[PDB]
Amino acid sequence: VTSEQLLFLEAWRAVDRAYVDKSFNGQSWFKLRETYLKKEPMDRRAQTYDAIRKLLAVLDDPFTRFLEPSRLAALRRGTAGSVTGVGLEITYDGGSGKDVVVLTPAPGGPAEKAGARAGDVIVTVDGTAVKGLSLYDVSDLLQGEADSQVEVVLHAPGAPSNTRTLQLTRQKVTINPVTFTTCSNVAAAALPPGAAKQQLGYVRLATFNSNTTAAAQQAFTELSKQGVAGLVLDIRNNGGGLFPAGVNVARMLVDRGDLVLIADSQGIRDIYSADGNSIDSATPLVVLVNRGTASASEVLAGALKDSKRGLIAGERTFGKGLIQTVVDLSDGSGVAVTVARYQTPAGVDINKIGVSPDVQLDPEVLPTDLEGVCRVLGSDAAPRLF
Numbered sequence: 001v002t003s004e005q006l007l008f009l010e011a012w013r014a015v016d017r018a019y020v021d022k023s024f025n026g027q028s029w030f031k032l033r034e035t036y037l038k039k040e041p042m043d044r045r046a047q048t049y050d051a052i053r054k055l056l057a058v059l060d061d062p063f064t065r066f067l068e069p070s071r072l073a074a075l076r077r078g079t080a081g082s083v084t085g086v087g088l089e090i091t092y093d094g095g096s097g098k099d100v101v102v103l104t105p106a107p108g109g110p111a112e113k114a115g116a117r118a119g120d121v122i123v124t125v126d127g128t129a130v131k132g133l134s135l136y137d138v139s140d141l142l143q144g145e146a147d148s149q150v151e152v153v154l155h156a157p158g159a160p161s162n163t164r165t166l167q168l169t170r171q172k173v174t175i176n177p178v179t180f181t182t183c184s185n186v187a188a189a190a191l192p193p194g195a196a197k198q199q200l201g202y203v204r205l206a207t208f209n210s211n212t213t214a215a216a217q218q219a220f221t222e223l224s225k226q227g228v229a230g231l232v233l234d235i236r237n238n239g240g241g242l243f244p245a246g247v248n249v250a251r252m253l254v255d256r257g258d259l260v261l262i263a264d265s266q267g268i269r270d271i272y273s274a275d276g277n278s279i280d281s282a283t284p285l286v287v288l289v290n291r292g293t294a295s296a297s298e299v300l301a302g303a304l305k306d307s308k309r310g311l312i313a314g315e316r317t318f319g320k321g322l323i324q325t326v327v328d329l330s331d332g333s334g335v336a337v338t339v340a341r342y343q344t345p346a347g348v349d350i351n352k353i354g355v356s357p358d359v360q361l362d363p364e365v366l367p368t369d370l371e372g373v374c375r376v377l378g379s380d381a382a383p384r385l386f
Contacts (some may be wrong), residue, residue, distance in 0.1 A: 014327035069332040104239035120290030129195035176216035183374035192284035195229035208241040240295025285310030290363035294318035302344035313359035321350030
């Protein structure tokens with residue numbers, strides 16, 4: 001057994017042990033391993049890399065890929081530079097014919113500005129058809145020199161005809177995780193049953209990152225302090241990002257019971273529950289969501305709904321429920337692998353299904369800016385949130 005063969009095996013093993021589906025997409029994982037060891041050239045590192053890649057492909061899971069030591073490192077050093085993008089976070093389609101689609105059009109970003117919406121299929125990036133490419137490959141296409149341009153062609157799902165050809169200028173897009181306000185003189189159409197007052201606390205979590213937690217905490221604390229009659233938690237177009245932030249937020253609102261299950265073809269492998277340490281467990285709550293509501297955000301929504309902590313209003317969410325992790329190799333290289341799936345507290349997959357609203361509403365109706373928000377809520381055509 002050579003060093004190179006030993007390395008290929010670390011990769012094969014990473015999947016053998018961690019993969020989400022222990023039937024390996026109806027393939028004999030073990031048979032593959034032996035076959036490859038006998039048939040695939042692996043005398044030089046570069047070739048062992050090709051072998052791993054070839055191996056990973058049989059699973060037919062676009063999220064599962066191999067990463068070379070440099071790319072891994074660079075992923076890691078990540079976010080920094082004059083490297084800029086177009087305000088687009090991506091993922092693959094919720095039922096894979098293939099497709100790379102928009103996950104999140106960053107608020108006030110180029111893509112956003114141009115009309116790109118969550119869920120839109122990306123056909124090409126500067127002439128190259130992106131279908132089936134690694135998300136890493138795609139990110140690279142969209143990324144580039146500061147203030148430079150790139151052509152993105154997209155179409156609405158199921159309408160390859162209805163395409164739009166975006167000419168985008170690459171620029172850093174700073175984003176804020178949390179904003180909130182108190183809306184006063186709120187219309188009644190918008191108040192929870194029996195509101196002592198016409199005031200709603202509004203909390204906008206546009207993103208789940210490392211800053212979300214502290215800002216959300218503070219927000220709920222103040223609002224509770226003010227005794228608003230109801231809370232509006234807006235997670236529309238929030239790609240999810242940081243899972244832990246999603247859980248911390250949910251613990252702020254739900255004081256007991258289960259929040260989210262981590263499952264695979266084995267059964268439940270892990271679970272996250274309330275820790276009892278909430279900020280507000282009593283003010284009536286409504287959560288705004290939409291098709292751009294994904295991953296950690298959907299976990300939050302699911303927890304709020306299933307526990308009966310709040311109603312869900314808007315339109316069904318993204319349905320992005322897979323969990324990928326990177327397994328590092330001795331190499332310094334790594335295998336990004338899908339290892340689990342989020343399920344709601346009720347035992348339902350987030351993947352494909354998403355979170356469904358209790359109050360079906362046009363998710364467009366409400367603005368995202370504080371002023372505009374209070375304006376629509378305190379008005380004649382204020383949405384019937386509750």
